[PDB]
From a paper:
Autophagy receptors target cargo to autophagy by binding ATG8 on autophagosomal membranes. In this study we discovered that the ubiquitin-binding autophagy receptor NDP52 binds preferentially to LC3C, in contrast to other autophagy adaptors including p62 and NBR1 that nonselectively interact with several human ATG8 orthologs. NDP52 comprises an N-terminal SKICH domain of unknown structure (aa 1–127), a central coiled-coil forming region (aa 140–420) and a C-terminal ubiquitin-binding Zn finger domain (ZnF, aa 421–446). We determined the crystal structure of the NDP52 N terminus (aa 21–141) containing the SKICH domain and CLIR in isolation and in complex with LC3C.
The NDP52 CLIR was disordered in crystals of apo-NDP52 but became structured in the 2.5 Å complex structure of NDP52 bound to LC3C. Similar to other LC3-LIR complexes (Noda et al., 2010) and to SUMO-SIM interactions (Hecker et al., 2006), the CLIR forms a short β strand that fits into the canonical, hydrophobic LIR binding groove of LC3C. As expected from the NMR data and mutational analysis, the interaction is driven by extensive hydrophobic interactions of Leu134, Val135, and Val136. Ile133 of the NDP52 CLIR β strand is at the Trp340-equivalent position but due to its shorter side chain does not occupy the aromatic pocket and is therefore largely solvent exposed. And in contrast to canonical LIR β strands where the first and fourth residue mediate binding, the CLIR-LC3C interaction is dependent on three consecutive hydrophobic residues, the Leu-Val-Val motif, which occupy position two, three, and four of the CLIR β strand. Val136 in position four and Leu134 in position two of the CLIR β strand cooperate to occupy a complementary, smooth hydrophobic surface on LC3C in which the Leu-pocket is less pronounced than in other ATG8 family members. In addition, Val135 on the opposite face of the β strand exploits another hydrophobic wall of the LC3C binding pocket, formed by Phe33. However, it also improves shape complementarity with the hydrophobic CLIR pocket, and enables additional interstrand hydrogen bonds between the CLIR of NDP52 and the β2-strand of LC3C. While the LIR of p62 forms three backbone hydrogen bonds with the β2-strand of LC3B, five bonds are formed between the CLIR and LC3C, which may partly compensate for the missing aromatic-pocket interactions. The N-terminal α1 helix of LC3C is disordered in our structure; it is possible that this helix is stabilized by acidic residues upstream of canonical LIRs (Noda et al., 2010).
Author numbering:
A (entry chain A): 21 to 80, 88 to 137
B (entry chain B): 13 to 126
Write the structure that this text describes.
Amino acid sequence: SQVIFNSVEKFYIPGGDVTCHYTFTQHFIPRRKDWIGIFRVGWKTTREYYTFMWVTLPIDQQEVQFKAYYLPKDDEYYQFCYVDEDGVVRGASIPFQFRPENEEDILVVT
Amino acid sequence: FKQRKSLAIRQEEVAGIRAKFPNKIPVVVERYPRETFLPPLDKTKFLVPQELTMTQFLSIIRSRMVLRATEAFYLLVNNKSLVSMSATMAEIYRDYKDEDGFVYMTYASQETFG
């Protein structure tokens, strides 16, 4: 709703850092304990985050970077969620997997 | 690789492959297990054009060898089937395709069937 994720990939290569792109809607006011976290799809509560980053500062079309080490190892679906200081999710991305789109043993012939 | 993956998992892999490349034929290529001479591949699944001949496909397989071997060798569908090397992948798929949606090939420099 109030926070929107852009350029979210369906696939993120394991071992690469993930740049998360987000934009605040016109009437949304970000706060400094606000955060972005990566949730298994089907998360029940915001306390279930796999990994997180604080909303990036300072704030003047935003991005935050997730280091490869802290990213999910498995084949499950995840999404970005924006959680404000009150514990309220203000935006959630399309789902994605941490995995090559094409497994490496695959060779495309043209 | 019927032993590593379940029928449904393989059918799913074919589904995904076909969704990204609906025009290709998915081919599982495997080194004859008793091969002592030819080197292994850096690739397992080959997504090939319908019109590609068995010969051209053999040259591709050769190009994926982790060591360089110029020697002639055999391409056996299912490891049971000697086929015309002038045959296109479309024909091999029509005639030899596995129930899971994959075509299987074994490459060997020599083999003795029972």
